[PDB]
Amino acid sequence: KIEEGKLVIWINGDKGYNGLAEVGKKFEKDTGIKVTVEHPDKLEEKFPQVAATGDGPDIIFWAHDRFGGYAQSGLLAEITPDKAFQDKLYPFTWDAVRYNGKLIAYPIAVEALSLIYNKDLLPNPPKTWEEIPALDKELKAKGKSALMFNLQEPYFTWPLIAADGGYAFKYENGKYDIKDVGVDNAGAKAGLTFLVDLIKNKHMNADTDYSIAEAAFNKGETAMTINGPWAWSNIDTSKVNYGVTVLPTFKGQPSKPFVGVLSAGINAASPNKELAKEFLENYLLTDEGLEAVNKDKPLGAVALKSYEEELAKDPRIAATMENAQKGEIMPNIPQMSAFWYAVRTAVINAASGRQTVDEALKDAQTRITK
Template identity: 35%
Template sequence: MKKFLVIALLVVSLVVLAQPKLTIWCSEKQVDILQKLGEEFKAKYGVEVEVQYVNFQDIKSKFLTAAPEGQGADIIVGAHDWVGELAVNGLIEPIPNFSDLKNFYETALNAFSYGGKLYGIPYAMEAIALIYNKDYVPEPPKTMDELIEIAKQIDEEFGGEVRGFITSAAEFYYIAPFIFGYGGYVFKQTEKGLDVNDIGLANEGAIKGVKLLKRLVDEGILDPSDNYQIMDSMFREGQAAMIINGPWAIKAYKDAGIDYGVAPIPDLEPGVPARPFVGVQGFMVNAKSPNKLLAIEFLTSFIAKKETMYRIYLGDPRLPSRKDVLELVKDNPDVVGFTLSAANGIPMPNVPQMAAVWAAMNDALNLVVNGKATVEEALKNAVERIKAQIQ
């Protein structure tokens, strides 16, 4: 009998020692809330969740080193534009379909998709929107024609002391909503993923979008020298009525005492929405982890739920990736405005070839707004330059 008890105790000890543990790498903002959720998961499922803080800039490089050896975190929290590189190297595991997927914004899911497969659970989005000073613009314009009309009235009324509208005139990130809204694209989306050899930055839609920018310059609403610093400082000082900027700027405007509002960027034409770049944060599973099935279960059956996502929002208040979570925070008009803008948007391409795009497009826009090249010439040359760098 005593021998049996010893064997039984030994078996129990081995089970306890062999009990799997999930390790999560995340940046500082997610640590507290994920630790609390991990404790709840352990209480319910008996699985320990260890949350480790890693500087955001170091998560991907550290994971690239550790994961091929079957080491490192079981789950990482990071940006969607890591997905292409990590998926190609076989380091993150596809997420199978689960019932709650229908409740996520399509933009957020597309951001974590590669080659027709979902490689992460998105929890937060980021995109630019129209920010307006209510002292000059009580209600936001619905179309760009309305914006232009309001901006001209303000320019005339205040004699240049207050600008009606400003954005960063020669910066691709801020002009992309015009290009994408009219049908331009960076890389063609196919069933197998992004085709980096099919670049749509000089197609008919892209040309039409940049011509809208040129119109704003030609009609004196934008100045070729307008940049982020000018836009941001003038709005903060109450000298700009409308700008296009992101949620990162809001605190400074609040601190400055600006009575502002946030709304989606006006339609380019009635029924033609502007489509900004969207950045998405989410959870990815280490494909080499011995605990990957448990990690997927943790994400799909616990983290991805409405209640959990809402608590993550409360702990790290960014634009929610679930539509029903937005309903829970609809009393925050800033979050609603930016989220609706993001819902119209295009995920930043999650492939390394995107690095070749920025300088080429910024230079093209600079030439256009300064009258040194036609829209068609500038965009054609930019695409040729991007293709050359990719090749």
Template identity: 30%
Template structure:
């Protein structure tokens, strides 16, 4: 059964979000680890790390990255034993590109695991099939996750993890949570002026900029990247970069930069933003759940919250990233693939294994509830993801990040905010039209 977004909404009672995102961009966002040691598994399951993938002759082949190979292998081994088949779980570098190439040559996996913003490119290349799951099953997942894995009104991925930017706070330096970004910037600047910290507010900018980390600020100030069409999907012809609201956002961001208050600087980048915060040299860090381990190990008191908006402005909406399971269109055993993704993975037990093993906040709502009871701070990560906007998965998003990131770096370095956003919008439109 191929589920359209309208069918999911009607049958499951999931309201389509008026605004919607994983992660993409740069800075300190999580990346696929480099190929390392080969995990070992028992039974008939083969797990390996490869940069030049070879499908092999297993009945069910699953491609993922090294971060997730452990929990996926655990689930896949049980699936293989229950069904009397062999299963190979492989960690593949440059996963999206290698998958599309191998699938086109009919030498790829049956299942691939990756970010939701790959969907547009994978669908454009005919690399994945819609999932065969029911509306009741879809209703178990958070609306933002369902929205993110839906493309052209078809459900293509089974979402298991959600990620979005949050605001970390050193509670030894700032005991009370800021109600607005203005309050956070002002507090950070006071601490910096007093010599208590090196940086007022750790948001990765760097010389190349970081559109991903700037998105909460941009959206609170009224900006958007792509609008939505009548079908609820992103509309590449509706580019918000360079419009009036975008210009106003650029002007306000300029006031926070090196030519203004200095709350944001290019000296903070993806290379040092988490480390500086963990060293106690910044009261705030705008990052994601991937920073939590470093923050916990820092040894000072800390807390986390969804990113607040500017005073008198709109809510801050980071990009929400979804990790999901997909069925390859040219897999050797698509029936096994649909069964594994739609039945075996589509359970709280399997999603719990993924959460424990990969430590990405879950998208299954019952698991969210049970895990928050054990870890109350998880709620802030979920609130941020639910309030965010799914990263546009349309192929045209590939033309956005580099010029928009460079625009933010230039603005924070002293360039005119409004003029820079207009020029950047023109650059993106030209790239999309090519």
């Protein structure tokens, strides 16, 4: 039997914890149910080490990515007790937290934007992808390269060309198919031939992969770097970053990786999970509570439609929200293997000049429909 009458809140660190504290001050003053609030920087390993004994926090806040294993381990409790709370949110944001049949977490915020930089807190982000090769030679003229990455794989090169118009699979406002593959589309080749244009002249590092890029960033040489998707079956080197940064795009067109939104889950070890669910839908999710956390730090768009319109009163929010609306969610289909295996060969074919971009694309799209 667990300790009844209490709740604990752990956050990522560097977040607007001071604004969130007040929400818990109000609720605990009205209900008496304890509310602790902490701003740790190692909770990602502590949460699964304490909650495993039923002694960890009662609530957790992280992107769905890190939740890909916590629910399987039994740490995340079943959420969505009824259907009313679902209508309070947009449908896409629910898909962004799904599991096989059952549910494991719920959407909180909608800010899909981050970018990594050198060990020096000098804010000088790139203006566009076409400036990278232009700045690379200028920094090399006084030291080393500007930006480096795993150009050798499709996972990181997908968000490049998708800006011109390429897309993996179509996903309407709740209807999905795998038949509509935007691989063999002019936009894919358009952005892809830019990469190859540099390699053509050998001015660009055509031999840089994950290993080369990762290492150089660890050394502190690369003035900037990119991270995010998981190509390999495991990661051996993990980077970290405080706050937010802008993200460069293509010539007159924004980029679109995946719809990465903020989520929350209830700990399954608590005695009465209702205490947590109630606090969330009584004081956190209010025009006063959400405002308090947003006052302490900018949180951008929200999953809660009722307050979405309020934050949407400013363009910084609205535009960032539209980027998630027009975006796609990473699927859970087996077809991804065929897709990854196919596109990999098409990029190598263009990079090696073994085949025309146009034809390698045609071939590749066929490998996904055959």
